[PDB]
């Protein structure tokens, strides 16, 4: 009915700003407080001032909240264009309030950017053009289009930067984890929104007659089932734009899924198994043992230290070593579970010496690799 | 002769061979399904469009296999079996190799856009999260005078994730570029002719400090070859390597070029401890910016010590109220009224004098050297006035030039 007006407002806002920039570049080519404002705006969006940390925290909350408002409006609608007076539609009112905030943030980021031409072509500038002008046209007419606003799912890709400006991602593996998960999730969610638009709108060169009414959630499921190359075909695309999008998606997202899943499995596999600390019992002596710890050195040690011909004494053994124990040594540690305990660490670290409560031990025993390349180096 | 580069040759060979093989295979399947099986008198046929064949072959190349479309002629099915054996290997090797090629392009390219009134400093040599974080924590420290110098890192590496974070946290005033001071094009990108200074950092923990100093001398040479008048400050690991850069034709200590030789300085600080037992600690604490920050678990000696670490050494102009005092009167005055420890002055050529005797007067606009907690403290020596401020009890009131 009227969707080309919502699309036009995004294009004329993009184009008129690009024209003003291009003629300004030509005028300044043929022919202070500005820099103070640029630096202030840059510090503000970088979260360097306290008001900057407030604005950065608001971008985090309102980007998530806007996306949840898109999930509601995408779940509770049938025709992609839909007649609704704005005074009645409560979601369209909070959506306007968030779009006003994102318009203020857009002008702040503009002020902050070094080259205005490249700024007007940044991905988030397109997310703003395809969302903010349409949300005002949704007041001037008594209807809404669930159009390009699925691009709000890309605003999630700001989150790793917010969690860097707020200095909370302190560790390189944890930075990599959050960048992986948020980029993967936001790309999957935005792709599902694009397929939802294409199948429900139908092919324009077939007068929109060829259409297929998927829910957003069916698109989201179908894109995971094709990302992973499972391809049940319980659901499939049938519009020509749907099928051409699925071909483009397969070429891109198989590489994303097939590299994401291994890298997350590495990151979540990295956490130490034998962490923690020795819980000292009310009347048991213990001995800390370290240096050369292996299945051979531990089995020969325990076979003598716990031998049946010794006097019956309830000493516990606490191994402290840098390695993860091998499968044969993990078995041996489990067979002696009642009286042998193992911790990842080194006697070179006072925190590891506290974890094994070495002040309360009888003794520390330091074993040697008798078969090393260099016994002066081992000593 | 338009494909001039081996990666770009490989890109075009990959894409065109992949696309042409996919398009021709789709054409062959389109012929087979629409013509039907000849040994069934062409009765077994299935009217696919070319575009449905093209889609179906991508969906089987990638091993997705929806089965919304499938081959049903015996020649179609036998072609799909042959296609699966060939094209799974093509797709599964093409997609990674394109992802490598498009992943190869440099992130931190481009050039420094010099603002209308901001000084900048180029920094290079050993750039890492550790060296940059210790550098920026002192160079941008809150106890320094407020000056809007920008820092421009130039280095060959892609920054690691921890360093990318640090560069984003300082986005307003720290910039980073991929490159080397060994290339005149990279020296132009950072506009080094318009910088105040170039700072060349060293890997103090390298395998070979003569090799690391040889690398840093060749950076100094490259900077000075590009433009002689850049102030170069370089960290050297070995003392004997200093002679090699004193002999550069365009090196000039009177123009402010300097070599921070950590071997010379280390042995000098500890040698002064032989003359005054703890002095290496007294003195090393003066040359790092630090603000005193109590925590209640500290013992008295640790609080006394840590308050002492809040000190640094600062240079500031003595006000006209000091004119024609002896250095002893100026030092008594700074200590007693201003709470500033004045210890030396620049006597107008001009020369530094440390604790000079009663024979030396403070001349007009004499630069003094102070030990103090912050640059905000020493300003008081510049604002002090013998009529306006001379009766003030609390030093926080000494301010605003006393006009
Ligand atoms: Ca200080
Ligand atoms: Mg126990
Ligand atoms: Mg700048």
Author numbering:
A (entry chain A): 14 to 44, 79 to 426
B (entry chain B): 214 to 561, 567 to 621
From the manuscript:
The large-conductance calcium- and voltage-activated K+ channel (BK) plays a fundamental role in establishing negative feedback loops to control the firing patterns of neurons, transmitter release, insulin secretion, and smooth muscle contraction. BK channels comprise four identical α subunits (Slo1)2,3 with seven transmembrane segments (TMD) and a large C-terminal cytosolic domain (CTD). A voltage sensing domain (VSD, segments S0–S4) and a pore-gate domain (segments S5–S6) reside in the membrane. Additionally, two homologous regulators of the conductance of K+ domains (RCK) in each subunit (RCK1 and RCK2) assemble as a tetrameric gating ring (4× CTD) and serve as the cytoplasmic Ca2+ sensor.
Mutant R2Q also led to active-like VSD structures, regardless of Ca2+ binding. However, R2Q VSD lacks direct coupling between S4 and S2 at residue R2-D142 as seen in the active VSD structures of R2Q and WT. Neutralization of either R2 or D142 resulted in the loss of a voltage-dependent S4-S2 coupling and reflected an increase in the activation energy to open the channel. This result suggests that the interaction between S2 and S4 plays a pivotal role in voltage sensitivity and the VSD-pore coupling. In mutant R2Q, we expected to find a configuration in which the VSDs are active, but the channel is closed since this mutation impairs the coupling to the pore. In the R1Q (apo and Ca2+-bound), R2Q (apo and Ca2+-bound), and R3Q Ca2+-bound structures the S6 gate adopts an open conformation. The resolutions attained for each mutant were as follows: for R1Q, 2.7 Å in apo and 2.9 Å in Ca2+-bound conditions; for R2Q, 3.4 Å in apo and 2.9 Å in Ca2+-bound conditions; and for R3Q, 3.6 Å in apo and 2.6 Å in Ca2+-bound conditions.
